[PDB]
Amino acid sequence: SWRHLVCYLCFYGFMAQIRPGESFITPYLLGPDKQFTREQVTNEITPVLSYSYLAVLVPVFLLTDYLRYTPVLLLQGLSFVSVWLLLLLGHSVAHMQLMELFYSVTMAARIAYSSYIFSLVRPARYQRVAGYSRAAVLLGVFTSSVLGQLLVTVGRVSFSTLNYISLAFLTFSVVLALFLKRPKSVLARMLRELGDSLRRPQLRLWSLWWVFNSAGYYLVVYYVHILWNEVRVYNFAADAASTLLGAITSFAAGFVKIRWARWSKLLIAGVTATQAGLVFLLAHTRHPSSIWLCYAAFVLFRGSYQFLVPIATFQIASSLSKELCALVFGVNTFFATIVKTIITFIVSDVRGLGLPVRKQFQLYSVYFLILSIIYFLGAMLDGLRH
Ligand SMILES: Cc1ncc(C[n+]2csc(CCOP(=O)(O)OP(=O)(O)O)c2C)c(N)n1
Hints:
Elements: H1 2-16, H2 25-29, H3 38-66, H4 69-89, H5 93-108, H6 110-120, H7 126-152, H8 159-177, H9 186-198, H10 201-222, H11 225-230, H12 234-253, H13 264-283, H14 291-318, H15 325-347, H16 357-384
The structure holds thiamine diphosphate.
Thiamine diphosphate is lined by residues 22, 25-26, 45-46, 49, 103, 141, 218, 221.
């Protein structure tokens, strides 16, 4: 129980994120084995992920609290396995949409893991465990991407073989999830407790942070590969180093000692202001001998956000005097994606304000600046109301 509760939980998080084939799904689909064209992949596969993620996220946070966070973690493991089973056995676009549907389920089930670590350990160690699990999750993402590239670049093994390596690892993650300790109108009660909990000032500040800052962070991270492509060993190294830096900063967030009643709004504003300038750095820089600076801007931006996520998870869980840690996590992830979709519609899509990728980032930079000013203002009014 001593070693089991914390070390094994981080070990599961580290090994659940081991996916050599996750970053090479599209090239594997667009390959000699499966013989799929770009139009089928772009128009029939990727949109299914977007729609199914929203339709699966809504039930996932309602059920993970009641069914406890073990079956959903076990469901996440099984759902991931069926994704690669359909990848290695699929022949038509129908199989690919089903595996994209299963893939969307898996991304909806990561809120269960984040809340699971909070139900396992006493509230005293909420901050340290939050830093540990996020560090373990990001260390898994980093070592999955690096081992994924190494097997394909310095290694000569085919995509099908590389996907087999993921399948064996993913089965191991399923086995690991099978030994996780399960902690010991209904809809009206949880919604009523949702409103009562949101009345607290600490959770409300961080929940609003989750909705908006994560939407901006995901917008930057999602519209970053295209931005570099619009301008192949270097666009991964930034991704690999960004996840590594996020792991270190998330690990360091479980050891920071800050009085989370007076310097909470200021810390959010300081990080958001840093991200606002950093995103602007990624945008307004186009010199050929300046791409290294752009990657340097990206890694710290990823680290700055991933530094505050364990803090946000720790504060929300500590401010929730109920077993509703997952429901708030799901609601914030629900609204963050909705806000992310809304900004994409206005800033990127033609029916709204059509801009090229360069113009989008400066729009995202001012979006962060508005967010930073709001938190800076929010801290000042809280400060004058000492
Ligand atoms: C067809 C297809 N299915 C799945 C993927 C993988 N995928 C789609 S959305 C997504 C999440 C975006 O990752 P990111 O924002 O970098 O994650 P984080 O750093 O927050 O863990 C991933 C991994 C893909 N590229 N293509």
